[PDB]
Design an enzyme around this catalytic site. Structure first.
Site, PDB file in Angstrom:
ATOM      1  N   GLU A  93       0.828  -1.207   0.000  1.00 55.11           N
ATOM      2  CA  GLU A  93       0.000   0.000   0.000  1.00 55.11           C
ATOM      3  C   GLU A  93       0.852   1.243   0.000  1.00 55.11           C
ATOM      4  OE1 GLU A  93      -2.986   0.221  -0.672  1.00 55.11           O
ATOM      5  OE2 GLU A  93      -3.937  -1.689  -0.103  1.00 55.11           O
ATOM      6  N   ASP A 113     -12.357   8.645  -8.532  1.00 55.18           N
ATOM      7  CA  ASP A 113     -13.585   9.214  -8.002  1.00 55.18           C
ATOM      8  C   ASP A 113     -13.431  10.474  -7.218  1.00 55.18           C
ATOM      9  OD1 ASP A 113     -12.849   8.218  -5.490  1.00 55.18           O
ATOM     10  OD2 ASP A 113     -14.550   6.969  -5.193  1.00 55.18           O
ATOM     11  N   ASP A 130      -6.610   8.048  -0.693  1.00 54.99           N
ATOM     12  CA  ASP A 130      -6.148   7.074   0.266  1.00 54.99           C
ATOM     13  C   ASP A 130      -4.957   7.624   1.030  1.00 54.99           C
ATOM     14  OD1 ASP A 130      -8.063   5.378  -0.887  1.00 54.99           O
ATOM     15  OD2 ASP A 130      -6.630   4.010  -1.719  1.00 54.99           O
ATOM     16  N   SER A 167     -11.936  10.629  -4.215  1.00 52.79           N
ATOM     17  CA  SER A 167     -11.476  10.287  -2.862  1.00 52.79           C
ATOM     18  C   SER A 167      -9.958  10.146  -2.880  1.00 52.79           C
ATOM     19  CB  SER A 167     -12.151   8.995  -2.393  1.00 52.79           C
ATOM     20  OG  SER A 167     -11.783   7.885  -3.176  1.00 52.79           O
ATOM     21  N   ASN A 199      -7.779   8.770  -5.871  1.00 53.10           N
ATOM     22  CA  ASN A 199      -8.556   7.833  -6.672  1.00 53.10           C
ATOM     23  C   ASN A 199      -9.333   8.570  -7.744  1.00 53.10           C
ATOM     24  OD1 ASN A 199      -7.829   5.670  -4.865  1.00 53.10           O
ATOM     25  ND2 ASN A 199      -9.304   6.513  -3.407  1.00 53.10           N
ATOM     26  N   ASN A 215      -9.167   4.993   2.841  1.00 57.58           N
ATOM     27  CA  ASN A 215      -9.892   5.796   1.864  1.00 57.58           C
ATOM     28  C   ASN A 215     -10.872   6.778   2.488  1.00 57.58           C
ATOM     29  OD1 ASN A 215     -11.273   6.663  -0.417  1.00 57.58           O
ATOM     30  ND2 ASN A 215     -11.579   4.644  -1.349  1.00 57.58           N
ATOM     31  N   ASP A 246     -15.497  -4.887   8.787  1.00 55.84           N
ATOM     32  CA  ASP A 246     -16.668  -4.392   8.055  1.00 55.84           C
ATOM     33  C   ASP A 246     -17.371  -5.466   7.233  1.00 55.84           C
ATOM     34  OD1 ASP A 246     -18.192  -2.016   7.118  1.00 55.84           O
ATOM     35  OD2 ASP A 246     -17.264  -2.497   5.192  1.00 55.84           O
TER      36      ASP A 246
HETATM   37  N1  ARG Z   1      -7.574  -1.076  -2.792  1.00 59.02           N
HETATM   38  C1  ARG Z   1      -6.378  -0.626  -2.439  1.00 59.02           C
HETATM   39  N2  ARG Z   1      -5.516  -1.441  -1.846  1.00 59.02           N
HETATM   40  N3  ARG Z   1      -6.044   0.639  -2.676  1.00 59.02           N
HETATM   41  C2  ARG Z   1      -4.755   1.227  -2.327  1.00 59.02           C
HETATM   42  C3  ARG Z   1      -3.804   1.262  -3.512  1.00 59.02           C
HETATM   43  C4  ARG Z   1      -3.829  -0.051  -4.278  1.00 59.02           C
HETATM   44  C5  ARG Z   1      -4.018   0.111  -5.787  1.00 59.02           C
HETATM   45  N4  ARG Z   1      -3.245  -0.892  -6.510  1.00 59.02           N
HETATM   46  C6  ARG Z   1      -3.628   1.522  -6.216  1.00 59.02           C
HETATM   47  O1  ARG Z   1      -2.519   1.981  -5.940  1.00 59.02           O
HETATM   48  O2  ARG Z   1      -4.450   2.199  -6.808  1.00 59.02           O
HETATM   49  N1  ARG Z   2     -19.473   0.325   5.833  1.00 64.40           N
HETATM   50  C1  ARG Z   2     -19.046   0.632   4.642  1.00 64.40           C
HETATM   51  N2  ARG Z   2     -19.543   1.679   4.030  1.00 64.40           N
HETATM   52  N3  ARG Z   2     -18.082  -0.028   4.081  1.00 64.40           N
HETATM   53  C2  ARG Z   2     -17.563   0.289   2.795  1.00 64.40           C
HETATM   54  C3  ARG Z   2     -18.640  -0.073   1.849  1.00 64.40           C
HETATM   55  C4  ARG Z   2     -18.070  -0.313   0.519  1.00 64.40           C
HETATM   56  C5  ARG Z   2     -16.729  -1.022   0.483  1.00 64.40           C
HETATM   57  N4  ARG Z   2     -15.641  -0.050   0.555  1.00 64.40           N
HETATM   58  C6  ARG Z   2     -16.694  -1.893  -0.798  1.00 64.40           C
HETATM   59  O1  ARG Z   2     -16.424  -1.466  -1.993  1.00 64.40           O
HETATM   60  O2  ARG Z   2     -16.583  -3.125  -0.764  1.00 64.40           O
END
Ligand code: ARG
Ligand code: ARG
Ligand code: ARG
Ligand code: CL
Ligand code: CL
Ligand code: CL
Ligand code: CL
Ligand code: CL
Ligand code: CL
Ligand code: CL
Ligand code: CL
Ligand code: NA
Length: 129
Positions: free
Chosen positions: A35, A48, A52, A50, A46, A59, A101
């Site tokens: 990461e 969108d 990280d 957002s 990202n 995120n 989660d």
């Molecule tokens: N879903 C994730 N692990 N996001 C964090 C970065 C990982 C992804 N390969 C990127 O750099 O865009």
């Molecule tokens: N409690 C939450 N809102 N968790 C994240 C929901 C969506 C999650 N990041 C997904 O793409 O799998």
């Protein structure tokens, strides 16, 4: 701060991340490696809009407030900047919520793609733990 591998393993262990939600310490170290390259100050935008943040690339879409991710949530109740500290406490506490989660460590797509199913104990090999 850029942690060393064993240095981060020790810090994650002290903060209770080792075997948290059943994920051994090497899973967490592997995830941090891919990461952030162990850099607490890592940020990545990202498509969108957002962002990280931090050693575990948490995120803003869901977990922290950065003030510029419209419609997003702040489920860890923290500014995203807290996730960039030398001290990993805020990142660990928030990571505990994320991994709880429903999808486990699959929330970190880099973990799924680069750590899941591999010899993750290699990431703590040799460390004095
Ligand atoms: N879903 C994730 N692990 N996001 C964090 C970065 C990982 C992804 N390969 C990127 O750099 O865009
Ligand atoms: N409690 C939450 N809102 N968790 C994240 C929901 C969506 C999650 N990041 C997904 O793409 O799998
Ligand atoms: N010096 C280390 N133990 N580094 C992490 C291990 C790397 C792991 N064997 C891999 O396949 O990428
Ligand atoms: Cl462990
Ligand atoms: Cl392990
Ligand atoms: Cl890489
Ligand atoms: Cl926002
Ligand atoms: Cl720390
Ligand atoms: Cl912190
Ligand atoms: Cl799980
Ligand atoms: Cl796994
Ligand atoms: Na947010």
């Amino acid at each position: 701060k850029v942690f060393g591998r064993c240095e981060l393993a020790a810090a994650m262990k002290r903060h209770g991340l080792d075997n948290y939600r059943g994920y051994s310490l090497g899973n967490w170290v592997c995830a941090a490696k891919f990461e952030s390259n162990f850099n607490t100050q890592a940020t990545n935008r990202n498509t969108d809009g957002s962002t990280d943040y931090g050693i575990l690339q948490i995120n803003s879409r869901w977990w922290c407030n950065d003030g510029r991710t419209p419609g997003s949530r702040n489920l860890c109740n923290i500014p995203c900047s807290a996730l960039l500290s030398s001290d990993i406490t805020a990142s660990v506490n928030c990571a505990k919520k994320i991994v709880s989660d429903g999808n486990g460590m699959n929330a970190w797509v880099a973990w799924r793609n680069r750590c899941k199913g591999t010899d993750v104990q290699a990431w703590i090999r040799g460390c004095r733990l």
